[PDB]
């Protein structure tokens, strides 16, 4: 009812009341904590009986936000919604409700450290779309708008909500822009190893792969439960940064580059019990995502060795910290490169400090701020960023982004 | 909680099935609605006996003799002894088993592959602070072992009524001192200002430099605590130099060899050993990242990078990161040159994955706190970052307990 969190570096204490409005499973029980499990665990469409309570709850809070709680607008909306559910077994969100819900799902995303930006989100209503070609057009405009010549702008595009589960819209890509990965007969991997399965699907659908280290994957788009269709994103819309280093003249010879726009397209947006299974959203990068995870995870581009080599690092024993030494210079290269090309990026120190400031303001004005420590803390230099020493509470507020099965595991073909 | 619980390693796709969690008992603090995995810290007649019953069962189950020979008569004996003494006293074998399993069940501890190679010092005959000091001195000398450190625990008398607790008032057997300065700043270890002031209030004569070794403040049987100076020749210390930066030695940095936790409470069979200092050897990052680089500790980043002559204006130069790596290089290089036992976070984390695999195979699970197990530097390049971990409390265990000065009724 009045849960306290403490910062162990500053001794600031915060009081959380917002946790009382939480709902869905964390995955934890009184006896077991799952806060490091990645995701705790078709038919999934709700009844009329399940829907109105969820809908009423979301409408009640929308109206509470606009300072109209209990108004005649509020009461007619509740009636309009209840009646629409009763006669059509679902309901449609006003455009105002759609924008509020998108922004609040971002605000409520406990694993997201950049939520200080949550209310500055551009929302593209794509609920009038009916085909895969239409989807391709809607996504291109999103990419072009969000990219903005390097001055990135947060955005989400929202396609039609689920109905009976059998007519879903999906983006089969997990992100709008990612690089292919090709496994070789000899077990080696060309390109990004994370993407080998999906690259294989693309090729199976007719994609002619150029078979390179940095090939942009086609889009694979599903409208109204139909089979998905392929579309090349027009290359002039895919902004890319070549990775050089302020001090090492040789770093450019590593031939590394990355795309500027991170855009998640495999999650599911829940608003008032309604499920938007295709809602690609996009922000700008924290530098550690590229330089620590994409380049350095052993199951990703795995360049630590090569960088280490060119630094002439003693790689005999681990205790030389040759990996730690090499990772820092990679992450210096990535930030310096985006900055040099005026492509929006944020470093892990700036980003985490901003988050603490956000979290503190959310406690003051909203009464809480659910945060997943295991994801908020950056994957390098942890304890020298302020979030490490920050106690956080994790709970699920709705509206929310949620994981959903991979469409190729669920879709039934024709 | 369901028949299984599987956990996955994302870097390797290795999957492990947990069944041990069906034996946890106490609150994690989490509920189905909210999770507290990052919060630091979320008996009488009927109370005491069933905890003893479970442990003895656990013990006799642990030696292929469940329900067997002495087992029932040990259950009888414990039942009988509680009836007369209100509590009961652990056999030497039980004490060794419980202490080793307290380490085993320590979800926050990355070193637990070593758990069963623990040296147990039974100090349950102690009666005075002078005796506590002797028992501790012998622990420190054994555990230090001229640099080839060995893990040990010394267990003082169990609690009996709260009025007569045995307490080590230092949080570690060996810490440096912290002095407030006439101009608001701090000299020494800033985490230790309060304790340093208590010791001075108690008559400690401080030399007033950075790395002054704190005295021992021992409390036996609930009486007021007493100061003792550990004999310097027992306190192994390492001067931190760098294998590349000649100027690094000029930083004046040194640190001690023996991490030895003296403020926690060891729980076996419902009994409470409020004095039980235990010591291992260091993971390099504890010294280099946390002690040296936490802003509320020695806070040397600015110092190091300034002599590294790094661009310290904008954060995105990553000057803190660069200096941080160099510092922890110097710590490992310093301990290894002085042949003092130390482990880096790559070896340690890799060791913990083997242990996890071992525990799942032989025991059916291994409680781990991902938040504490992942090193505070270079997270995702160690193997524990990609390891799912379940966390749950098993007994016997080490627990936290209140600072004695917040609770002590002075004689
Ligand atoms: C504005 C700049 C943004 C920054 C700097 C940022 C930062 C991050 C980072 C570093 C992660 C962890 C990703 C990983 O390690 O895989 C993350 C996750 C996430 N972000 Fe943000 N983000 C931003 C924008 C957004 C927006 C616009 C939304 C939604 C409208 C959003 C929703 C999420 C969600 C749902 C996750 C969880 C991802 C998952 O569970 O797989 N973020 N964010
Ligand atoms: C032998 C080498 C050992 C290594 C390398 C090691 C490593 C570590 C590290 C790095 C931590 C985190 C400490 C912190 O960040 O404050 C920790 C915590 C802990 N270790 Fe170990 N450890 C070792 C031995 C032991 C022994 C012998 C015991 C008990 C008999 C033990 C019990 C614990 C406990 C209870 C914690 C929890 C700390 C807390 O709650 O504050 N460890 N260990
Ligand atoms: C909106 C937004 C802002 C921001 N800064 N970052 C993101 C994450 C995007 C992103 C994440 C990933 C990796 C995430 N996966 C890895 C596999 N694992 C099993 C599940 C999690 C790769 C991208 F190529 C990519 F683009 C989104
Ligand atoms: C057995 C063992 C082996 C090993 N390698 N390390 C340890 C950690 C001990 C240790 C920890 C600390 C600080 C840790 N505190 C900070 C405050 N926070 C609220 C709780 C944790 C300082 C020591 F001087 C010290 F020694 C124990
Ligand atoms: C608030 C947060 O839980 C706290 O700072 C934790 C984070 N993880 C940690 N992990 C270790 N090993 N040691 C610590 O002291 C901490 N501190
Ligand atoms: C098992 C573990 O939860 C997993 O590796 C998580 C840990 N924390 C993370 N944190 C971020 N920001 N991104 C991630 O992908 C992960 N992966
Ligand atoms: Zn939990």
* DSSP letters for B98-135: HHHHHHHT-TT-TTGGGTT--EEEE-TT--SHHHHHHH
Helices (H), B288-344: 292-293, 301-308, 319-337
The answer to whether B115 is a known catalytic residue is no
Domain B18-124+151-161+265-279+349-373, CATH 3.40.50.300 — does that match? Answer: no
Fold of A128-153+168-239+403-407: Nitric Oxide Synthase;Heme Domain; Chain A, domain 2 (3.90.440)
Pocket flag, ligand 2, residue B398 (CB < 6 Å): yes
CA distances from A37 to A74, A406, B385 (A): 40, 18, 11
Q: Do A380 and B376 touch (CB under 8 A)?
A: no
A26: nearest CB among B5, B32, B389 = B32
Please tell me which residue in A207, A258, A284, A322 is annotated as part of the active site: A284
Angle between helices B92-104 and B45-61 (to 10 degrees): 90
Which tokens go with B12?
């390797």
Which tokens go with A79?
């009636």
Query: From B314, which residue of chain A is nearest by alpha-carbon distance?
Result: A350
Domain B237-259+282-347, CATH 3.40.190.10 — does that match? Answer: no
Contact residues, chain B, for A14 at CB < 8 Å: none
Contact residues, chain A, for B27 at CB < 8 Å: 30-31
The answer to whether A118 is a known catalytic residue is no
Which among B24, B22, B115, B98 is positioned nearest to B56, based on CA atoms? B98
Backbone angles phi, psi at A117, to 5 degrees: -95, 15
Q: Is A375 annotated as a binding residue?
A: yes
Distance from CA of B310 to the nearest CA of A (A): 12
Pocket flag, ligand 3, residue A217 (CB < 6 Å): no
Measured between alpha carbons, how far apart are the two ends of chain A, in Å?
53
Pocket flag, ligand 3, residue A281 (CB < 6 Å): yes
Distance from CA of B206 to the nearest CA of A (A): 26
Ligand 2: atom nearest CA of B108 is 37
Q: Do B329 and A325 touch (CB under 8 A)?
A: yes
Asked whether A19 and A2 are in contact (CB, 8 A), the reply is no
CA distances from B342 to B94, B169, B278 (A): 30, 26, 17
Q: Whose CA is nearest to atom 36 of ligand 2?
A: B109
Pocket flag, ligand 2, residue B278 (CB < 6 Å): yes
Q: Which ligand is closest to the CA of A262, given by its number?
A: 3
Q: Superfamily for A240-262+285-350?
A: Nitric Oxide Synthase; Chain A, domain 3 (3.90.1230.10)
Q: How far apart are CA A259 and CA A176, in angstroms?
A: 11
Pocket flag, ligand 6, residue A36 (CB < 6 Å): yes
* Displacement of CA A310 from its chain's centroid (Å): 34
The answer to whether A289 is a known catalytic residue is yes
Specify the CATH number of the domain B125-150+165-236+400-404: 3.90.440.10
Which tokens go with B284?
């390099």
Pocket flag, ligand 6, residue B382 (CB < 6 Å): no
Q: Do B318 and A335 touch (CB under 8 A)?
A: yes
Burial class (CB in 10 A: 0-12, 13-18, 19+), B406: exposed
B30: nearest CB among A26, A299, A332 = A26
Backbone angles phi, psi at A208, to 5 degrees: -95, 105
Q: How far apart are CA A332 and CA A381, in angstroms?
A: 13
Which among B400, B402, B325 is positioned nearest to B108, based on CA atoms? B400
Pocket flag, ligand 5, residue B42 (CB < 6 Å): no
* Displacement of CA A322 from its chain's centroid (Å): 32
3 state SS of B279: strand
Asked whether B255 and B284 are in contact (CB, 8 A), the reply is no
According to DSSP, the β-strands at B282-283 and B342-343 are parallel
Distance from CA of A333 to the nearest CA of B (A): 9
Measured between alpha carbons, how far apart are the two ends of chain B, in Å?
49
User: What is the CA(A366)–ligand 6 centre distance, in A?
Assistant: 27
Please tell me which residue in A112, A129, A202, A279 is annotated as part of the active site: A112
Burial class (CB in 10 A: 0-12, 13-18, 19+), B244: exposed
Q: Do A33 and B391 touch (CB under 8 A)?
A: yes
Rounded to 5°, the CA angle B372-B375-B377 comes to 135
| Technique of determination | X-ray
Domain ranges of chain A: 16-127+154-164+268-282+352-376, 128-153+168-239+403-407, 240-262+285-350
Q: Superfamily for A16-127+154-164+268-282+352-376?
A: Nitric Oxide Synthase; Chain A, domain 1 (3.90.340.10)
Asked whether B169 and B195 are in contact (CB, 8 A), the reply is yes
Q: How far apart are CA B76 and CA B92, in angstroms?
A: 18
| Residues followed by a gap in chain B, C→N > 2.5 Å | 42
Q: Whose CA is nearest to atom 36 of ligand 1?
A: A112
The answer to whether A236 is a known catalytic residue is no
Which tokens go with A1?
């009812």
Asked whether A7 and A391 are in contact (CB, 8 A), the reply is yes
Asked whether B349 and B315 are in contact (CB, 8 A), the reply is no
Non-local (6+) Cβ contacts of A97 within 8 A are A58, A59, A62, A271, A272
Q: Whose CA is nearest to atom 10 of ligand 6?
A: A375
Residue B173: DSSP 8-state:
S
Q: How far apart are CA A98 and CA A100, in angstroms?
A: 6
Cα-Cα-Cα-Cα dihedral sign, residues A166, A168, A174, A179: positive
Q: How far apart are CA A155 and CA A152, in angstroms?
A: 9
Resolution in angstroms, to 1 decimal, for this deposition?
Answer: 2.1
User: What is the CA(A338)–ligand 1 centre distance, in A?
Assistant: 18
- The number of helix segments (H) and strand segments (E) in chain B equals 11, 19
Q: How far apart are CA B321 and CA B143, in angstroms?
A: 34
Contact residues, chain A, for B33 at CB < 8 Å: 19, 22-23, 26, 395
Q: How far apart are CA B163 and CA B378, in angstroms?
A: 46
CA distances from A243 to A129, A153, A290, A345, B357 (A): 38, 22, 11, 13, 39
Non-local (6+) Cβ contacts of B266 within 8 A are B98, B99, B102, B153, B155, B272, B273, B276, B396, B397, B398, B399
Mutating to test ligand 2, I would choose from B111, B153, B284 the residue with most ligand atoms within 8 A of its C-beta, which is B111
Ramachandran class of B307: left when φ > 0, alpha when ψ lies in -120 to 50, beta otherwise: alpha
Q: Do B344 and A323 touch (CB under 8 A)?
A: no
Mutating to test ligand 1, I would choose from A283, A353, A354, A376 the residue with most ligand atoms within 8 A of its C-beta, which is A283
């Amino acid at each position: 009812r009045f849960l306290k969190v403490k910062n162990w570096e500053t001794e600031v204490v915060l009081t959380d009341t917002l946790h009382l409005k939480s709902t869905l499973e964390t995955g934890c029980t009184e006896y077991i904590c799952m806060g490091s499990i990645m995701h705790p665990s078709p038919e999934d469409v709700a009844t009329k009986d399940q829907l109105f309570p969820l809908a009423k709850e979301f409408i009640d809070q929308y109206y509470s936000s606009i300072k109209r709680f209990g108004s005649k607008a509020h009461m007619e909306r509740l009636e309009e919604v209840n009646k629409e559910i009763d006669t059509t077994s679902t309901y449609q969100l006003k455009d105002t409700e759609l924008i509020y819900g998108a922004k609040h799902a971002w605000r409520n995303a406990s694993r997201c450290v950049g939520r200080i930006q949550w209310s500055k989100l551009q929302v593209f209503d794509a609920r009038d779309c009916t085909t895969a070609h239409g989807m391709f057009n809607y996504i291109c405009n999103h990419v072009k708008y969000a990219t903005n010549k390097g001055n990135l702008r947060s955005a989400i595009t929202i396609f039609p909500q689920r109905t009976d589960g059998k007519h879903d819209f999906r983006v089969w890509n997990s992100q709008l822009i990612r690089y292919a990965g090709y496994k070789q007969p000899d077990g080696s991997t060309l390109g990004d190893p994370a993407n080998v399965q999906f690259t294989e699907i693309c090729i199976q659908q007719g994609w002619k792969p150029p078979r390179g280290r940095f090939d942009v994957l086609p889009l694979l788009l599903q409208a109204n439960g139909n089979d998905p269709e392929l579309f090349q994103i027009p290359p002039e819309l895919v902004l890319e940064v070549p990775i050089r280093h302020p001090k090492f003249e040789w770093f450019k010879d590593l031939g590394l580059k990355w795309y500027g726009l991170p855009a998640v397209s495999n999650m599911l947006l829940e608003i008032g019990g309604l499920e938007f299974s295709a809602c690609p959203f996009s922000g700008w990068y924290m530098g550690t995502e590229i330089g620590v995870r994409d380049y350095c995870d052993n199951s990703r581009y795995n360049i630590l060795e090569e960088v280490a080599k060119k630094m002439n690092l003693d790689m005999r024993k681990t205790s030389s910290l040759w990996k730690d030494q090499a990772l820092v210079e990679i992450n210096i290269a990535v930030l310096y490169s985006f900055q040099s090309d005026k492509v929006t990026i944020v470093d892990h120190h700036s980003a985490t400090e901003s988050f603490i400031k956000h979290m503190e303001n959310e406690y003051r004005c909203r009464g809480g701020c659910p945060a997943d420590w295991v994801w908020i803390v950056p994957p390098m230099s942890g304890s020298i960023t302020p979030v490490f020493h920050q106690e956080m509470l994790n709970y699920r507020l709705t509206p929310s982004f949620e994981y959903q099965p991979d469409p190729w595991n669920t879709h039934v073909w024709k």
